[model samples]
Every structure is written in C-alpha cells, then in structure tokens.
Target chain A: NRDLFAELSSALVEAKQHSEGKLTLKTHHVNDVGELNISPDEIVSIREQFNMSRGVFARLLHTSSRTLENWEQGRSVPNGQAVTLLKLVQRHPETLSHIAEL
Target chain B: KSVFVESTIFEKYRDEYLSDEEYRLFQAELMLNPKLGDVIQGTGGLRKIRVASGGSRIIYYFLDEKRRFYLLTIYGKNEMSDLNANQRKQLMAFMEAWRNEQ
Candidate 1:
C-alpha cells in the first residue's frame, strides 16, 4: 500500500516536472493505481490548498461530493479517470482554478 | 445560549488527536460559526470542518438545530476517500440511522 502511495505521488511529481505546453502523457499505466494508495490526508491538504469544501472540490473534479468524501476518508480509492484527474490536480492545482469558479 | 455535545466518535478522536487548547479553540470557532463548512449532501444538513492537525486533516461534522450543535464524528482524514453510487446510498443510510438514533 505504501509502495502504491509512493509510486503514485512520485509519478505525479514527475509528471508536473516534465510538462510543457500541456501535460503530454507517454503512457497510461495502472500497476501503481491498482492499489491506489493516495492517502486521505494528502487529499485533505489539496482541498485546503485550494480553499475548497468537499462540494466545491467535487464540482471542480466533475464528481459527486460523496465520492470525494469517501476518498478523503479512506472508505474507498479513486480509480481510472478519477485517479488521473487527482494526479492532474496534485500536479497543477493552480491551473485548475477555472473549474473552481463553477 | 448554545453549547456543543459531541458524539462518542468525536470525543474519542478529540482527546486522541487534539490538544486541550486546540479542542477548545475549534469548539469556540464552531460556536460562533456553526455553518462553517458546507452542508454535506445526503448527510441531512450536517456540516463538516477540516482542521490541520498531526500531519493530517481532521474532519468533523455537526448537526445544527435551532440553538444547539450536536457534534458528530471526528476522525483523521485517512479513513475513507471516495464513493460510488452504492456507497453514497450507504452514506445516506448511515446518516439516516444516526439521525434516527437522536
């Protein structure tokens, strides 16, 4: 589980570091995401960094508030597209301010 | 005059995670701003507040009825993180059960 967390967070960091005009993905893999160990603590910090409530953050991510709540509480882990979006937000939170405008 | 009555879960984690002064500080703030966080959908108007503590976010909710605030669960943000529709239904069901308990 910790390995998944480390890989996911590390991959996101690398993605942020190597992005150009747009984030170009070399590949979409899920070996790390099968476990999807993004910690709930980190999710909370991300929301706080954006000054968002669960509702607002969910809206920004185009998901439901309960889904976001579950992720933040560790009841469940995000998968596929949700995990991708979370990585994007984790990498470039400032770029996504327009979503929060909704 | 309004006061706070915490659920058993809240009391357990409060002592475990928050210092005496910090607990009082949060209580004082909630007393003044009972509508602090957004009302969680499907939670029957319960509101959540996120506090930065102990290298994690501490989330708590409360039921604001006329003049009294009933503090619900307090736990570190790492418990659950995302929800599907079924889980959302389950959350709503849990909230309903909690409401019935009161």
Candidate 2:
C-alpha cells in the first residue's frame, strides 16, 4: 500500500498547501476499505478458493484474462465494478458456479 | 478573503519538487490572488502557476463558489516543453472526471 499511501498523502498536502491559510488540516483513519485498497493477495485467495484459473476467473467476472492476471500479479488494482464483483465472489463462491457459459 | 485549495496529483511530488519555503510562498501568493497564474490554452479554465525553482509548474483551476481552487497536477519543464495533444486530452479528461465527482 506504499503507492496508495504516497498518493493519498500527496493529495492531502497539496490541498493543505493550496488552502491559502484558510483551511485547517486534520487526518483520520479510514475504517472502511475503498475499491483500490483491495489487494492482489485477497483477489488471488478468492479465486484459488473457488478453484478457478485466471482465465476462468476473468470469464466469470466478464473481464479479460490479462486484466485478471494484472490484478493477481499486483501490477494493477481492479476497477470499481470489478472490485464490487470480487467482494461478492469472496462472500459467495457458489455465485460463479451458477453463472454458466463462461 | 481566502481561497480553498484542492488537488488531484500534485502532492505526491511536493517534497521532491519544492522546498518548504517555496511551497509556503506559492500558496501565499495564490491565496492573496487566486487569478495570479497564467492561463494554459485549450485547458478550459485551467491555469499554470509557475514555481520559480527548477522550472516546475502547478496546473490548476479556480472556482468562485466557496472560494475553491483545484490543483489538477504538476510537472517540471524538463519533462516536456509543453502539454502535448495527448497530455491535453488526458488532462481534460481528468478535469471532467474531477468536475463530475464534485
């Protein structure tokens, strides 16, 4: 999460610097995870638990295998819609089994 | 009498790009006069605020409601001469996305 933290802090400081001395600065811990915070480890864990290969998982998610590979490899995070779907799949692996014609 | 500053991707490079004094003075100037920066053509309302050190620049747009200023991004002159066609397109796209989010 180094890149995420770096980007987040950069955004915070940029806003603080530009606030023209009018805004007060404060920080807080986020109790919830956002779409980008979902990690490849969790993604791979969910997929492997379902006993699906990258291609099969991609098909189940209606995305390209390359995209799944990127997510699994930590090269990129999944988009919002995919993240929602991944969360759903994590909670219910049998949902993929129901979706036929992959 | 004061303006708020918001940003997308400027803070990530803040430490590497500008000193504490430089950032402080820059923000002070913008706060004193939000319209101080030169306009970047083809960027809609976006303006380029030149930082004196290392030919660095901050790109932003200003808003009257709530006295808000949006810092879109920053770059160094050595990275490129000016915003190219693709860069302009990307910037505009991000600006649009930012606007919609607001």
Name the best candidate (by lDDT): 2
Candidate DockQ values, in order, are 0.01, 0.08
Cα lDDT of model 1 by residue, B1-102, tens digit:
565555434555567767878877776666667788677675445466777744554454544454455554555667544334554465566456545745
Let me know the DockQ for model 2: 0.08
Off by over 4 Å in 2: A1-102, B6-8, B53-64, B86-102
Ten-residue region with minimum lDDT total, candidate 1 chain A: A24-33
- On a 0 to 1 DockQ scale, where is model 1? 0.01
Query: Could you give me the TM-score of model 2 versus the true structure?
Result: 0.40
Residue A51 displacement (Å), model 1: 54
lDDT of 2 by residue, B1-102 (tens): 444444545545556676768766776677667788866665445666766653665444444356556554555654434556665565456546555655
lDDT of each: 0.59, 0.61
- The CAPRI classification for model 1 reads as incorrect
TM-scores for every candidate against the unseen true structure: 0.41, 0.40
The CAPRI-style docking tier of model 2 reads incorrect
